Design a binder for these strands. Structure first.
Length: 271
RNA sequence: AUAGCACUCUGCAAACACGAAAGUGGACGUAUAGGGUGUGAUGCCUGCCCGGUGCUGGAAGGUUAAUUGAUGGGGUUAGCG
């Protein structure tokens, strides 16, 4: 959707339109308060730069574990969620309990979902990787038994199931990494909704300020006391790029963990 | 500074940051996400060079630390003179 250039700040605005989303208030029992941080920790110092401001938001309690095995549920509606890029679906169980889940692509009001070993192979059903059919597209992949989904949760995300060896399943992630998972962990059929999410163009600086991003100052624009890039008469770089704390920014690898290196077989390539 | 563009790092107990540690932010987020760097709507575009410094990947050839202690040479005295 294009906006007409009636003002200079509207010339380059792109929006994604979805007419099936619910327009009313969210489901009250599943909503709680959430505060802004400003990127400051309990010492009160800034630990993440460029964070502050933005619109007030409530947190929606999303069920990532899907431990209500055996009971079918029906989708009531699809909702916008300010905490994430994907849409959410309100579920209605056969015994009156209501929960939120991440909405798979194509799920509409009136569809049926469930979880467990005996669930059918339909988008939105939650089954163990040992029971998943080989070659399927999955999302919401769990890493620790019972902890819940952690991988491939954003809009348009999906992973590919490739094979099953020993007690481990082989998956390919959307970053290009190829990895092992325990076969007992769960996953969900399908790929995540709102796949047009990356087509939007903000159009102006205020749009970023609404989402809570403060401006970025280049290190080249500072003094020597503030940044290794600071200083000089006129414009000049004269240095191999580094972070404000001296760490190289172009190609230098930073992974350190040695505990989980066995679970990665084929790295995405240029890690 | 900016919307837009590009490179690069990060598979989640994430990279990164604060702190002596416990711990906290990143985020009650999960590669369409998060950090760093440069450029700066849009239109047409963005040539040659990897010798130097850096980064990434190999090699098991040469050099090299703590550790180990084979050999060789001294000091001393039983005794022989």
């Amino acid at each position: 959707q294009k906006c007409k250039p009636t003002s200079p700040g509207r010339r380059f605005v792109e929006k994604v339109v979805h007419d099936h989303l619910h327009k009313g208030a969210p489901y009250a029992p599943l909503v709680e308060a959430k505060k802004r941080t400003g990127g400051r920790n309990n010492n009160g110092h800034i630990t993440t730069r460029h964070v502050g401001g933005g619109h007030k938001q409530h947190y929606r309690i999303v069920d990532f574990k899907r431990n209500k095995d055996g009971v079918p549920a029906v989708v009531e509606r699809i909702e916008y969620d300010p905490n994430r890029t994907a849409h959410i679906a309100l579920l209605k169980y056969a015994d009156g309990e209501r929960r939120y889940i991440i909405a798979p692509k194509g799920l509409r009001a009136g569809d049926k979902v469930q979880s467990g070993n005996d669930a059918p192979i339909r988008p939105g059903n939650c089954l163990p990787l040992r029971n998943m059919p080989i070659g399927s597209t999955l999302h919401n992949v769990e890493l620790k038994i019972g902890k819940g989904a952690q991988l491939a949760r954003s809009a348009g995300a999906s992973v590919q199931l490739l094979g099953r060896d020993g007690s481990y399943a082989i998956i390919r992630l959307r970053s290009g990494e190829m990895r092992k998972v325990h076969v007992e962990c769960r996953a969900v059929i399908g790929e995540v909704s709102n796949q047009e999410n990356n087509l939007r163009s903000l159009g102006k600086a205020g749009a970023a300020r609404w989402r809570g991003v403060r401006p970025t100052v280049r290190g080249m624009a500072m003094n020597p006391i503030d940044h290794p890039h600071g200083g000089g008469e006129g414009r000049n770089k004269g240095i191999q790029p580094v972070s404000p704390w001296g760490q190289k920014a172009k190609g230098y690898k930073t992974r350190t963990n040695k505990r989980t290196t066995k679970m990665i077989i084929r790295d995405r390539r240029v890690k």
